[PDB]
Amino acid sequence: VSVINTVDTSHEDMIHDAQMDYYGIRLATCSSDRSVKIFDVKNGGQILIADLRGHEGPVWQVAWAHPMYGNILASCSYDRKVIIWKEENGTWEKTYEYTGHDSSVNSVCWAPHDFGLLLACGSSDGAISILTYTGDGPWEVKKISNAHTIGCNAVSWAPSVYIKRFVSGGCDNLVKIWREEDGQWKEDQKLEAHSDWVRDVAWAPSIGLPTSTIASCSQDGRVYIWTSDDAATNCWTPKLLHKFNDVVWHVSWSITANILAVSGGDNKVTLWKESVDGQWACISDVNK
Amino acid sequence: SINVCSQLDWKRTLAVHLWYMLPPTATIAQALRLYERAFQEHGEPYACYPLPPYLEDCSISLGDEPSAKFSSLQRDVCVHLLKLYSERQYDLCQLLDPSSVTPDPLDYRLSWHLWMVLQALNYTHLSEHRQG
Amino acid sequence: SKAEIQRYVENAQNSASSPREKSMKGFLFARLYYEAKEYELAKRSVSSYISVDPKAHRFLGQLFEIEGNVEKAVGCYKRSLELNPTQKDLTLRIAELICTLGRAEYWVERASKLFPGSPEIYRLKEQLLSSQG
């Protein structure tokens, strides 16, 4: 509601996505100008600290890693290259470049620090690659082939509760949850409710709750809320939030109070919070 | 139709039923139920619907269909408190809704202290999920 | 208490003089008149609301029907249906208009598909067939 410092990005195109760090001192930003820029916003002062240009095509997503492993920043892209940057003594350098995909990599999401330094990459070839840094040596790659028939749009890991699980949504109209069994990523659930392409899926960071909640926005506009009271049962119940007329793009949960931020093609952000009785109600409308 | 109960807010309507209409020796529950049936019609709805103190200004226009709206409108915490005081069959969740006292759904102080008092009164029908 | 209604009249007057279009504010004042009873200005403000919604739509339709105004009934019902911000039933009086006009076949088939056990609509389509068969 209140207006703090407004940043000047010195960019040349539409910033497709952004993401702040764990402690809220920095902001990564990615645009269609093949450039990932790092901004140090401290005490209301916009300071461009780094400009990382290593892609051949547009950059779609940027994800910060947990503080304990250092300042690790992942950036996916259209050029089938997942570039992992790392800050050493104030200098950002490319440490690893995974080029094992046939089409555009659309999403990157780090695993909870408990599991390790795992990164999931969803690409338009219908494949999810799991990169793993063991501390010593290179990155072990586990590629889940034919995950989605057409392509994979978004990936998001479950809060650590340790059974490693992550949810992925694709253009095949199906939201799929994955689970690591015996060291192998196997398909766990198939949630079907959308009539069109799933654009983004994000697993709620459930705090003090037995229930697990996942949100999924789609092309048709219907935002569904998937809830499973018991993790063992794996019975997921969907609940329509609101059918937006314009294509909903991505969904994001708040860390502390689980408030969903929904953005549609109408250039507006609608905040939704579940009430005690159960009905979801919009609390504010923050348009561009 | 000489309605004596008219021009009175829900609280005063129940109070009048307790002293004047009912005998000097009566139980609270019976009076409450009678008042409830009074606005639920019989036969005219002479009593007033229990409305939150902020929603009173614009009582929903009951054009030919009052009941289909009453089944979505909330009631002030006091009614549910009286009901729980009488019996153990009621939704604690409705009772503990932030909107009832304050329109915004972000203020929770009262709700939380009330839940603590209810836990301390040996009344814990609330599900783990909602508590959390 | 006749007082807060006058205050709401003042506020709706302000939010009608400032935002001249004000179908919503003027419709709140019209709903005040409909809670009270001055059919002329009530229908007029509701007409401003609909033209410039099921509330004003049913107001216009039922007023036209109670006066016998098939023309205004068909206009209000058809406009509301084809724009539909919340509108289901007025197509019935639309069917009655189209019948009083061969034409009622569309709306009587619509009512047939929306409610199979329809005696009134079955007889209406029966008379439509008896005039257009």
Sign of torsion over alpha carbons C61, C63, C65, C68? negative
Question: Does the beta-carbon distance from C35 to B61 stay under 8 Å?
Answer: yes
Distance (Å, whole) CA A123 – CA A98: 12
Distance (Å, whole) CA B6 – CA A17: 60
> What's this structure's resolution in Å?
3.7
Sequence-ordered list of residues with C-beta below 8 angstroms from that of A112, at least 6 positions apart, any chain: A66, A157, A159, A160
Query: Cβ of A248: how many Cβ atoms within 10 Å?
Result: 25
Question: Does the beta-carbon distance from B97 to A208 stay under 8 Å?
Answer: no
Say if residues A179 and A163 touch (Cβ distance below 8 Å). Answer: yes
Sequence-ordered list of residues with C-beta below 8 angstroms from that of B81, at least 6 positions apart, any chain: B95
Say if residues A17 and A62 touch (Cβ distance below 8 Å). Answer: yes
b/e sequence A100-129, b meaning 16+ C-beta within 10 Å: ebeebbbbbbbbbeebbbbbbbbbbbbbbb
Chains touching B (3+ CB pairs < 8 Å): A, C
Among A32, A82, A36, A40, residue whose Cα is nearest residue A58: A32
Q: What angle do CA A160, A163, A169 make, to 5 degrees?
A: 80
Say if residues A15 and A28 touch (Cβ distance below 8 Å). Answer: no
Chains touching C (3+ CB pairs < 8 Å): B
Give chain C positions within 8 Å (CB) of B60: none
Is A195 exposed, middle or buried, given 0-12, 13-18 or 19+ CB atoms closer than 10 A? exposed
Say if residues A80 and A123 touch (Cβ distance below 8 Å). Answer: yes
Give chain B positions within 8 Å (CB) of C4: 57
Tokens of C56: 């004003």
Distance (Å, whole) CA A117 – CA A65: 8
Q: For residue A116, give how far its alpha carbon lies from the nearest alpha carbon of chain B (Å).
A: 28
Q: Do chains C and B touch (3 or more CB pairs under 8 A)?
A: yes
Q: Does B125 touch chain A (CB under 8 A)?
A: no
Distance (Å, whole) CA A17 – CA A28: 9
Please report, for residues A74, A81, A94, A264, B126, the alpha-carbon distance to residue A118 in angstroms, rounded to integers and kept in the order given: 11, 17, 17, 30, 38
Instruction: Give the determination technique.
Output: cryo-EM
Residue A81, Cα to own-chain centre: how many angstroms?
17
Residues found in chain B: 132
Among A67, A75, A68, residue whose Cα is nearest residue A50: A75
Strand A212-218 with A222-228, pairing: antiparallel
Q: For residue C101, give how far its alpha carbon lies from the nearest alpha carbon of chain B (Å).
A: 31
Residue A60, Cα to own-chain centre: how many angstroms?
11
Q: Does B77 touch chain A (CB under 8 A)?
A: no
Say if residues A101 and A147 touch (Cβ distance below 8 Å). Answer: no
Say if residues C62 and C33 touch (Cβ distance below 8 Å). Answer: no
DSSP designation for A232:
T
Question: Does the beta-carbon distance from B61 to C4 stay under 8 Å?
Answer: no
3-state secondary structure of C126: helix
3-state secondary structure of C2: coil
Give chain A positions within 8 Å (CB) of B132: 207-210
Sequence-ordered list of residues with C-beta below 8 angstroms from that of B13, at least 6 positions apart, any chain: B5, B35, B38, B47, B48
Question: Does the beta-carbon distance from C35 to B57 stay under 8 Å?
Answer: no
Q: Which residue of B has its CA nearest to A229?
A: B129
Is A23 exposed, middle or buried, given 0-12, 13-18 or 19+ CB atoms closer than 10 A? exposed
Residue with tokens 């998001």: A156
Phi-psi region of C47 (alpha: psi -120 to 50; beta: other; left: phi over 0): alpha
Q: For residue A211, give how far its alpha carbon lies from the nearest alpha carbon of chain B (Å).
A: 7
Q: Which residue of B has its CA nearest to C4?
A: B57
Q: Does A208 touch chain B (CB under 8 A)?
A: yes
Give chain B positions within 8 Å (CB) of A275: 97-99, 105
Q: For residue A10, give how far its alpha carbon lies from the nearest alpha carbon of chain B (Å).
A: 37
Distance (Å, whole) CA B104 – CA C32: 27
Q: Residue A226 pairs with which residues in a beta bridge?
A: A214, A238
Q: Does A209 touch chain B (CB under 8 A)?
A: yes
Q: Which helix (H) or strand (E) holds B46?
A: none
Q: Does B72 touch chain A (CB under 8 A)?
A: no
Question: Does the beta-carbon distance from B97 to A277 stay under 8 Å?
Answer: yes
Sequence-ordered list of residues with C-beta below 8 angstroms from that of A97, at least 6 positions apart, any chain: A54, A81, A82, A83, A84
Which among B96, B106, B128 has CB closest to A276? B96
Q: What angle do CA C45, C46, C47 make, to 5 degrees?
A: 90
Question: Does the beta-carbon distance from C4 to B57 stay under 8 Å?
Answer: yes
Q: Does A273 touch chain B (CB under 8 A)?
A: yes
Give chain B positions within 8 Å (CB) of C1: 7
Is C91 exposed, middle or buried, given 0-12, 13-18 or 19+ CB atoms closer than 10 A? buried
Q: Which residue of B has its CA nearest to A274?
A: B105
Q: For residue B103, give how far its alpha carbon lies from the nearest alpha carbon of chain C (Å).
A: 20
Q: Do chains C and A touch (3 or more CB pairs under 8 A)?
A: no
Q: What is the CA radius of gyration of chain C?
A: 18
